[PDB]
Write a protein that binds this ligand. Structure first.
Ligand SMILES: [Mg+2]
Ligand SMILES: [Mg+2]
Ligand SMILES: [Mg+2]
Ligand SMILES: [Mg+2]
Ligand SMILES: [Mg+2]
Ligand SMILES: [Mg+2]
Ligand SMILES: [Mg+2]
Ligand SMILES: [Mg+2]
Ligand SMILES: [Mg+2]
Ligand SMILES: [Mg+2]
Ligand SMILES: [Mg+2]
Ligand SMILES: [Mg+2]
Ligand SMILES: [Mg+2]
Ligand SMILES: [Mg+2]
Ligand SMILES: [Mg+2]
Ligand SMILES: [Mg+2]
Ligand SMILES: [Mg+2]
Ligand SMILES: [Mg+2]
Ligand SMILES: [Mg+2]
Ligand SMILES: [Mg+2]
Ligand SMILES: [Mg+2]
Ligand SMILES: [Mg+2]
Ligand SMILES: [Mg+2]
Ligand SMILES: [Mg+2]
Ligand SMILES: [Mg+2]
Ligand SMILES: [Mg+2]
Lengths: 173, 49, 182, 159, 50, 51
RNA sequence: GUCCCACCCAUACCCCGCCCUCAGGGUAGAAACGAUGCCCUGAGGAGUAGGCGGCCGUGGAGGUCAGUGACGAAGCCUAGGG
RNA sequence: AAAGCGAAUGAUUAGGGACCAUUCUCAAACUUUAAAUAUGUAAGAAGCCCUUGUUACUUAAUUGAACGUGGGCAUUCGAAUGUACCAACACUAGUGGGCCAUUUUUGGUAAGCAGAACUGGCGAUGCGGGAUGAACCG
RNA sequence: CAUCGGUUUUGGCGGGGGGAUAAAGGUCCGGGGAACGUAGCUCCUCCGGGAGUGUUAUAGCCCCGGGCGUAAUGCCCUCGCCGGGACCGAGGUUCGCGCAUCUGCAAGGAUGCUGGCGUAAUGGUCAUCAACGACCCGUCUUGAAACACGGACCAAGGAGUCA
């Protein structure tokens, strides 16, 4: 759905052999905190051998975008499982927040490569500080000198309950 | 709590108003309803009560 | 739908006598009122036994009454059933017995000894709650039919044989000389 | 099926472990069994006299009769729609005391001690065992170890 | 009077959780909000094929 | 009781079951304000929330 | 392919009415009742093979309704009624 | 199940040093190891502690074993949940052709084929959906 | 139609709590940067631009900190109130649980007011058209509407009895 970004800190339950265990922080993009904790244990199981039964969630709180009103460029590294293997990819998006870029990727990756949320791992999301960091053609064309384009065709908006119209609409809106 | 809980007949709720969602018999984590919706059971209770 | 394993299960115990005895109907009405309007658990048991059939109310003898009446003398013996006479009892002490029925020999001997042979409606008069009563039951499993119930190998029950003799069930499955033993 | 005698399918159940076959330890003969004890049957294949059928191997029962070099065990055998009492004469070589009963017996003795100690002292104590409870509130200090930020790893290496 | 105590009891319990969380933020430590002790179950999948 | 009445909608039925309902409303216990200058998080709490 | 709102309806779920079944209570110094009745409460209701209970109908026998009937019994017809 | 073969048994590739040290690949009727699911028992009043009694059994032995009298432990009587399944008996009906599906699995090239294990369904069952359908979904 | 009770649907209003005590944002005061480089300046064209320099100038932008500021909004969680509509009115002397106060009540289930008609007007049966649906029964069978068998139609007789 619409994703928030959570930081989730976990830990193995302290035992007699390990009175003070290590803390594991992780940033997760999830629709809600229930999924965010579920994603945390899924990633931590493969990474640090820690399981939910033998662990506890220290904290899980939302990180909100600092400047949601500044247009910035994002570069995302992921790995996904196709129907015949696993592949790493790099994509670039132009959004307002890291969450907005991630929602774009999940729709983009489903539209183009038919991948699903259960198949994609978000390795890293960064903000491109400058324009020479952009390495893709579809993003370089939106940061040109003075971007200005018309809107050809552009059929008008007519109420779907207004079944009949007296005159033929003009597509010059 | 054991005597107080057992004294209460099981609550006979109605179907939620608005709910549930497209696929109901999946875990709440993967877009369903089954399982542990931790603090979200209150929103469900309002619909079903 | 609801996940239940039984529906409309009935009580397994009788709730009214099958008898058309008009006098017994009056007796049940009296003990329905008594069992409802008193805290006496004795009244409830007497009401329940009035419903029972004839195989569940076996006869009792005066000897079995006498056997249990020590040192419970000064108590009224209550039997929801028939009190029969015992030839093997040469003398009958002074007893107070309340019962549904008395055989003519048993009633005469109890009364001749100087005791009371009263009915259950008389009992409800001076003892509306079984204040000093001895509730006694006859031998349930003394019936001939019960000797046949549960017949099987190594059960030591009575078989359905129409005659007694060296024949008809004595050869195979009854001794090791002819095959096996049971 | 085609062959349905005793010892059928007991190729592994009645065998002995890899490097503990041969001579039988004498602690088995020195254990003492009373009537009412709860013992576990484990057929030892090195002794072919006085075994128990493979259905009773691994089962548990209550001793009911003690004779010279064997004991009688009452075991409930599930036969279709009912349980049946089974009285098994098995040599002391195929059995051993059950530690679950011993753990219970140390607990019943212990419960008397706490109840006696509490009554003399003058406060009530809880005797029933309680299952694990949900964790209470606690505070975690990060003065020594700070959280480590971990991210999913790239596929990268093919092998 | 018992309703008075309960309303006050509910009022004070919630603030302590908030106060504990806020004080942990000031100190820099982490406070575990304690696991929930009561849950409500709802059966939503019929009586067939179980 | 021939007809169950909802205390959440019938005020009279609520009062037989909870006499403190009236005092709760007048005393405005559901709208208690907290005052004073709030104590915000330090700059160390942030810059740790974000990596 | 993915994500999000709104809406349609099963004999399913909730509330209410009614039928029946089962279960639990009350009802006599009776102004008292087809007590095999009445009053109150709660739950439940699919079904072949099969089991049980109550009721409807037909030919005869005993009792009874001081029963109906040539001023019209029984039978038969009747998109007339309860 | 998985795993193993520079570990036993059996099968098996290649080179090297004088049989030895290595190397590639396997096992329903092999194995040092070894899960998951299922599975036996216990969580007490018919119990526990102290003194003492009976015996023709046992002990060198009033030492034990079994069963007890008299005392002490109380309803927090020794985990949770439920009890919308108390226990037993009598008499008797129909049935003794089954079929389908997820998972496991045997013969077969395969089969809407033949045969099994757990569980759930149809037979015996209507209803909404899968246009339509004995088994699918609700 | 009015005032109520039960269930329910759909709107609106006021007040609290929480998160970085939202993040942002506006203005002001500081520090540091750059370009999709603003002014100015240097070059060719000079209708129209391009190139370079130039870090705010005769536009602005990005990052960090601080006052106004305990700012607002938004999301979630809550304590209450008021509207629009629909279906229903079971029960039948008082008793009860409660609230108010010297009145009573919305509190153990609907009353009050008004209007038309008083008859085929409501209602029922039948016929017919229309919307949606509906395979031929009995039987054997794992499975029957079956391209499985018996059945053209009607009346009367017809099969778990007795010792
Ligand atoms: Mg709706
Ligand atoms: Mg039902
Ligand atoms: Mg073994
Ligand atoms: Mg031999
Ligand atoms: Mg009602
Ligand atoms: Mg009743
Ligand atoms: Mg006529
Ligand atoms: Mg293998
Ligand atoms: Mg291995
Ligand atoms: Mg080998
Ligand atoms: Mg176990
Ligand atoms: Mg048979
Ligand atoms: Mg059949
Ligand atoms: Mg069905
Ligand atoms: Mg209303
Ligand atoms: Mg706020
Ligand atoms: Mg409303
Ligand atoms: Mg008409
Ligand atoms: Mg009409
Ligand atoms: Mg028609
Ligand atoms: Mg049709
Ligand atoms: Mg027929
Ligand atoms: Mg056939
Ligand atoms: Mg055909
Ligand atoms: Mg035929
Ligand atoms: Mg024909």
């Amino acid at each position: 759905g619409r994703l928030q970004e959570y930081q989730v800190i976990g830990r193995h339950l302290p035992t007699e052999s390990n009175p003070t265990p290590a803390l594991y922080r992780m940033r997760i993009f999830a629709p809600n905190a229930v999924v965010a904790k579920s994603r945390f244990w899924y990633f931590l199981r493969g990474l640090r051998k820690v399981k939910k039964a033998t662990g506890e969630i220290v904290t899980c709180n939302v990180i909100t975008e600092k400047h949601p009103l500044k247009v910035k460029n994002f570069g995302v590294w992921i790995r996904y499982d196709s129907r015949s293997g696993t592949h790493n990819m790099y994509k670039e998006y132009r959004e307002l927040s890291r969450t907005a870029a991630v929602e774009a990727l999940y729709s983009d990756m489903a539209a183009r490569h038919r991948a699903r949320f259960r198949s994609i791992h978000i390795l890293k999301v960064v903000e491109l500080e400058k324009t020479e960091d952009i390495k893709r053609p579809y993003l370089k064309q939106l940061v040109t000198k003075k971007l200005s384009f018309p809107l050809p065709h552009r059929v008008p908006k007519i109420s779907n309950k207004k079944i009949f119209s007296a005159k033929r609409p003009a597509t010059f809106a | 709590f054991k005597q107080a809980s057992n004294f209460l007949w099981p609550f006979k709720l109605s179907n939620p108003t608005g709910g549930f969602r497209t696929r109901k018999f999946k875990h709440f984590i993967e877009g369903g309803d089954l399982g542990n919706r931790e603090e979200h059971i209150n929103a469900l209770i309002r619909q079903m009560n | 739908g609801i996940d239940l394993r039984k529906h409309h299960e009935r009580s397994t115990h009788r709730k009214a006598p099958k008898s058309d005895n008009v006098y017994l109907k009056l007796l049940v009405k009296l003990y329905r009122f008594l069992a409802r309007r008193t805290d006496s658990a004795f009244n409830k048991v007497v009401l329940r036994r009035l419903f029972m059939s004839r195989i569940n109310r076996p006869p009792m003898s005066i000897s079995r009454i006498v056997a249990n009446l020590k040192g419970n003398e000064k108590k009224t013996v209550v039997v929801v059933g028939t009190v029969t006479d015992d030839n093997r009892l040469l003398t009958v002490p002074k007893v107070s017995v309340a019962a549904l029925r008395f055989t003519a020999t048993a009633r005469a001997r109890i009364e001749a000894a100087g005791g009371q042979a009263i009915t259950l409606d008389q009992l409800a008069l001076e003892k509306p709650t079984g204040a000093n009563t001895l509730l006694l039951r006859g031998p349930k499993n003394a019936r001939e039919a019960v000797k046949h119930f549960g017949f099987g190998p190594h059960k030591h029950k009575k078989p359905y044989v129409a005659s007694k003799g060296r024949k008809f069930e004595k050869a195979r499955g009854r001794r090791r000389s002819k095959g096996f033993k049971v | 099926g085609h062959a349905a005698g005793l010892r059928a399918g007991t190729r592994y159940a009645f065998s002995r472990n890899f490097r503990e076959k041969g001579m039988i330890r004498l602690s088995t003969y020195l254990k003492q069994y009373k009537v009412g004890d709860i013992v576990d049957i484990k057929v030892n294949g090195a002794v072919q006299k006085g075994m128990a059928h493979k259905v009773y191997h691994g089962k548990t029962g209550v001793i009911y009769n003690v004779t010279k070099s064997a004991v009688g065990i009452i075991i409930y055998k599930k036969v279709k729609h009912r349980y049946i009492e089974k009285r098994i004469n098995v040599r002391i070589e195929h059995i051993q005391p059950s530690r679950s009963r011993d753990d219970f017996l140390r607990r019943v003795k212990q419960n008397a001690e706490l109840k006696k100690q509490a009554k003399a002292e003058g406060k009530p104590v809880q005797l029933k065992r309680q299952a694990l409870l949900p964790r209470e509130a606690r505070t975690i200090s990060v003065v020594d170890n700070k959280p480590e930020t971990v991210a999913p790893v790239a596929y990268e290496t093919t092998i | 009077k018992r309703a008075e105590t309960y309303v006050k009891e509910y009022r004070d319990v919630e603030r302590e959780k908030i106060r504990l969380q806020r004080a942990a933020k000031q100190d820099g430590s982490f406070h575990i909000p304690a696991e929930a002790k009561l849950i409500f179950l709802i059966r939503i999948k019929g009586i067939n094929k179980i | 009781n021939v007809q169950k009445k909802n205390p959440l909608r019938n005020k009279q039925v609520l009062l037989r079951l909870n006499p403190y309902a009236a005092t709760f409303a007048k005393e405005k216990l559901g709208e208690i304000k907290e005052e004073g200058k709030p104590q915000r998080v330090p700059a160390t709490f942030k810059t740790l929330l974000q990596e």
